[PDB]
Write a protein that binds this ligand. Structure first.
Ligand SMILES: *[C@@H]1O[C@H](CO)[C@@H](O[C@@H]2O[C@H](CO)[C@@H](O[C@@H]3O[C@H](CO)[C@@H](O)[C@H](O)[C@@H]3O)[C@H](O)[C@H]2NC(C)=O)[C@H](O)[C@H]1NC(C)=O
Ligand SMILES: *[C@@H]1O[C@H](CO)[C@@H](O[C@@H]2O[C@H](CO)[C@@H](O[C@@H]3O[C@H](CO)[C@@H](O)[C@H](O)[C@@H]3O)[C@H](O)[C@H]2NC(C)=O)[C@H](O)[C@H]1NC(C)=O
Ligand SMILES: *[C@@H]1O[C@H](CO)[C@@H](O[C@@H]2O[C@H](CO)[C@@H](O)[C@H](O)[C@H]2NC(C)=O)[C@H](O)[C@H]1NC(C)=O
Ligand SMILES: *[C@@H]1O[C@H](CO)[C@@H](O[C@@H]2O[C@H](CO)[C@@H](O)[C@H](O)[C@H]2NC(C)=O)[C@H](O)[C@H]1NC(C)=O
Lengths: 75, 122, 109, 493, 75, 50
């Protein structure tokens, strides 16, 4: 719907506090955490995918973070 | 024909709950509000809350929130209303009115009830 | 914000009656005004079922409109039956409640 | 004196050779321009009144269905049309339904079915384009004159209206001459790309492209009852009961989802005129014709008494509220700041010239005493007032907070932040050009990236720079990553 | 609730048509596509980030696709 | 003709052509009708006639 495309990142920043800054600052992180907490098994799956696609440790952690971020937000 | 008829005139002493009722018939009850307006003797009209009988949600006036309760009871098409602790000041006649769901119909009331007058004295 | 209206009166010959409600920028300015007639001792009647729209009867003796923050009920000539208590009601958004006018005792004189 | 205790004021100590000093004015912030001899004054932008808005692209956030008619046909009989399909107020969708014996016709298969339903908008929201001609800026110029009721007063001050047309107004100060401000209102908010959508009694500034992108049924906004809504299928959902039949649903009110959608757009007050409270504009203000009232006034011999206890501003500047006891209606307050257990002059006077206008009223003298112990003297005689005061501060800490404030300004104004106090040096021009090019490239990349994603991208860039052998690429990644960390930590305002 | 967490991942499913399946099937991808079209520079930024972290074409491609799926969705 | 000695007033907001060129609509409030319009383009922070 319209709520999935928030007005975040558009270059209209000013000194005045924006509408729902406090809530909308952390709604996305709260969603990701609650999804990663209600579905623990995907942590195991993402660890497996990162281990078998990430040659170096930095690549492994980048892949793991991106997998644990995209899936809650692609729900 | 669609009309709203009240419970009938009631009298009670201060500090006694009263349950004013409003009968609805002739139309789809769930599709319109009951705006439960109030009018003191020889005073200006004062709206005090409406309920959505399709869901039971209640929008009390800020003054009357907590002091009054309203129940839909859609089985008998009877929009009840109660006063928690009736006081000497709150003597008036309580009309029940029909309003539309949308914004343009929030503040338009047709087919009012006659109004249950409640007298409060010791 | 609370919308207000004064009590008025006019003679039996219907020159003009100007009965006005002046609300805030949240109640009147964005919501349709609704006019109510109350003959004393009787339940109020919906004089206007929308802005400048009549449900039934009494044409050209009851005709309203709102411009900006204020609303009014105009006329082309009153009659003896037009003596009652009138109320303008709008749905406020800031207060999120239905506001009724302070009352007005229009008397045929 | 209007901008005292504002909490976002930042001084402009230096005046240029040609006596014009360039300031960027923000609504929340303040600017107290000083000068060698000109009367100091705190210009502050009130608001940006926008008038004659032209509504366009009304949007439905709710709906209603009323009529719903269905007509279905048999397999290999073609689609099943309705006479209401050609109407411009009916929304409907084709669906296949399995039919056969006991259902209307002999042949067995899947038959077409259509359910058309009228659409009514109920509540709606309208985006209003701001007419750039009618956009108006009002800016207050209060002068530090030491009025008794001026220490934090928002009312006192002479307003100067600024519009894209006739953007240079010489504000007439009461007795300080004319301050000719030459402000540039076309480099402020790019209002050509912001349209003011309004839901009920609330309005917001939203990027116009985003407003056009958000999916909701819309119409021309030509104040016509019963309009036709293009793309009205977004507020209706058609669902199949397995495969037997077809049903339409009005999908409720999208008002809360619209409140969530504009979760980063700054809010406007639409009560009365559509007054926009966010924003900024640049002002090159000329102090050529300012006259210091009281330059010709004499000193005063009688003693001074302070009515209320001395307080400290958030920016460390002391502020004195003192009443004259003499018989001299015009006066010039003597003022010397003595260092601890000694004699010196190391404390500035933030108010340009303190003058007693009347003995009946009292003057608000503001000052910026030096760090540490200090002694401030008001009177000139042997019975002079002694205001002992100690300033908790470190000049290194002041430098750090000044750099922090400058970074905050740079993270918002961007290209024009280099013009906040530009005296006119050639170094500032080169810095502004470099910043403008880099910022154009940066906002080309990071546009539409959320604050958490900005933090992530910046951390990733910093890590890449820390693990890159090529020194040029390592330095570039480190700098861009640090800047991105800062932006993502400050962006969501 | 907020649209950020739709009821699409739960294991419960049946023969019957789910509520708003037709729209919700492609709603997220439509949002990602329109965000990508609106802001094309981040395509360049994601290309650079994938190229400087992905040694193998599989690594670069997976990082690029995950990064282009996260930013429109995590906004 | 000579040069105008009186002020000008904008009657329609300036707008930018697709080719970067501005258009200006002014009305001259003065008595010497046949005249010339003085026109100097002051750059930003400098009076360079660019
Ligand atoms: C929340 O705000 C509302 C108003 O927005 C408060 O309603 C107020 O309720 C008191 C109850 O005593 C009213 O006082 C009464 O006023 C009438 C006026 O004729 C007087 O005759 C009575 O003796 C009594 O004093 C008051 O008028 C009313 N305010 C209004 C209608 O504007 C409500 O109490 C507030 N909730 C709180 C404080 O918890
Ligand atoms: C901001 O500035 C305004 C105006 O400069 C201040 O309003 C002023 O308030 C004072 C007292 O509060 C008024 O003084 C009056 O003097 C007469 C003289 O006899 C006395 O009888 C009155 O009782 C009163 O003391 C003064 O007239 C008034 N000026 C106006 C309204 O223009 C205001 O106090 C300042 N501060 C704030 C926070 O607004
Ligand atoms: C759509 O439904 C409305 C009512 O829901 C129909 O309105 C009818 O209008 C006629 C006169 O035009 C009245 O005599 C009927 O009483 C109305 N119906 C009801 C239920 O009150 C309307 O005809 C329907 N069709 C269209 C195309 O609007
Ligand atoms: C399904 O069965 C019902 C009854 O078993 C059928 O209804 C009967 O129809 C015949 C002829 O139309 C009547 O003479 C009977 O009286 C009906 N019985 C009832 C109504 O109980 C019906 O036609 C069958 N087919 C469908 C498609 O419903």
């Amino acid at each position: 719907s319209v709520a999935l495309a928030p007005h975040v990142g558009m270059g209209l920043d000013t000194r005045a506090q924006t509408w729902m800054s406090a809530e909308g600052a952390w709604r996305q992180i709260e969603k990701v955490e609650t999804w990663a907490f209600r579905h623990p098994g995907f942590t195991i799956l993402a660890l497996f995918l990162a281990h078998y696609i990430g040659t170096s440790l930095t690549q492994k952690v980048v892949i793991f973070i991106l997998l644990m971020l995209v899936t809650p937000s692609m729900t | 024909q669609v009309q709203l008829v009240q419970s009938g005139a009631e009298v009670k002493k201060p500090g006694a709950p009263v349950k004013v009722s409003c009968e609805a018939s002739g139309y789809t009850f769930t599709d319109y509000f009951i705006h439960w307006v109030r009018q003191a003797p020889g005073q200006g009209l004062e709206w005090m809350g409406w309920i959505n009988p399709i869901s039971g949600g209640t929008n009390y006036h800020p003054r009357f929130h907590g002091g009054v309760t309203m129940t839909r009871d859609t089985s008998m098409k009877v929009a009840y209303m109660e006063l928690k602790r009736l006081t000497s000041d709150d003597t008036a006649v309580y009309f029940c009115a029909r309003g539309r769901d949308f914004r343009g119909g929030y503040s338009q009331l047709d087919y009012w009830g006659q109004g249950t007058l409640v007298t409060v004295s010791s | 914000s609370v919308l207000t209206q004064p009590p008025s009166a006019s003679g039996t010959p219907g020159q003009r009656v100007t009965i006005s409600c002046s609300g805030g920028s949240s109640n009147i300015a964005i919501n349709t005004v609704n006019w109510y007639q109350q003959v004393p001792g009787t339940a109020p009647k919906l004089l206007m079922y929308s802005n400048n729209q009549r449900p039934s009867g009494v044409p050209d003796r009851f005709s309203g409109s709102k411009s900006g923050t204020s609303a009014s009920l105009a006329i082309s000539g009153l009659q003896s039956e037009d003596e009652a208590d009138y109320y303008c009601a709008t749905w406020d958004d800031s207060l999120k409640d239905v506001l009724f006018g302070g009352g007005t005792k229009l008397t045929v004189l | 004196m209007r901008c005292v205790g504002v909490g976002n004021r930042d001084f402009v100590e230096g005046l240029s050779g040609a006596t014009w000093v360039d300031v960027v004015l923000e609504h929340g912030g303040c600017v107290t321009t000083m000068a060698k001899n000109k009367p100091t004054l705190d210009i502050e932008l009130q608001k940006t009144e926008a008038t004659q808005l032209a509504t366009l692209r009304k949007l439905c956030i709710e709906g209603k269905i009323t009529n719903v008619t269905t007509d279905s046909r048999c397999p290999t009989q073609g689609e099943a049309i309705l006479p209401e399909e050609q109407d411009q107020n009916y929304v409907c969708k084709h669906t296949y339904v399995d039919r056969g014996w006991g259902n209307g016709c002999g042949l067995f298969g899947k038959g077409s079915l259509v359910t058309c339903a009228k659409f009514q908008c109920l509540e709606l929201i309208e985006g209003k384009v701001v007419q750039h001609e009618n956009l108006k800026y009002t800016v207050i110029i209060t002068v530090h004159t030491g009025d008794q009721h001026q220490v934090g007063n928002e009312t006192q001050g002479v307003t100067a209206e600024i519009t894209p047309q006739a953007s240079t107004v010489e504000a007439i100060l009461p007795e300080y001459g004319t301050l000719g401000l030459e402000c540039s209102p076309r480099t402020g908010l790019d209002f050509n790309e912001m349209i003011l959508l309004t839901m009920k009694n609330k309005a917001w500034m939203v990027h116009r492209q985003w407003f056009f992108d958000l999916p909701l049924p819309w119409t021309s906004g030509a104040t016509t009852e019963t309009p036709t809504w293009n793309k009205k299928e977004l507020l209706v959902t058609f669902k199949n009961a397995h495969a037997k039949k077809q049903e339409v649903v009005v999908l409720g009110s999208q008002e809360g989802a619209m409140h969530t959608a504009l979760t980063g757009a700054t809010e406007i007050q639409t009560s009365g005129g559509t007054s926009i409270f966010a924003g900024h504009l640049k002002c090159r203000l000329k102090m050529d014709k300012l006259e210091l009232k009281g330059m010709s006034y004499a000193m005063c011999s009688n003693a001074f008494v302070l009515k209320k206890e001395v307080s400290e501003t958030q920016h460390g500047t002391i502020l004195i509220k003192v009443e004259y006891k003499g018989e001299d209606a015009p006066c010039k307050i003597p003022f010397s700041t003595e260092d601890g257990q000694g004699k010196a002059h190391n404390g500035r006077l933030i108010t340009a010239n303190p003058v007693v206008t009347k003995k009946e009223e009292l003057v608000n003298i503001e000052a910026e005493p030096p760090f540490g112990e200090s002694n401030i003297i008001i009177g000139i005689g042997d019975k002079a007032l002694r205001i002992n005061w100690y300033k908790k501060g470190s000049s290194i800490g002041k430098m750090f907070e000044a750099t922090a404030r400058g970074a905050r300004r740079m993270a918002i104004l961007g290209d024009t932040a280099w013009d906040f106090g530009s005296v006119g040096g050639v170094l500032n021009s080169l810095g502004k050009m470099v910043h403008q090019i880099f910022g154009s490239a940066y906002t080309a990349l990071f546009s539409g990236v959320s604050w958490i994603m900005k933090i992530g991208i910046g951390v990733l860039l910093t890590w890449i720079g820390l693990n890159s052998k090529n020194t040029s690429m390592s330095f570039s990644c480190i700098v861009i990553g640090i800047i991105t960390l800062y932006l993502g930590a400050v962006v969501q305002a």
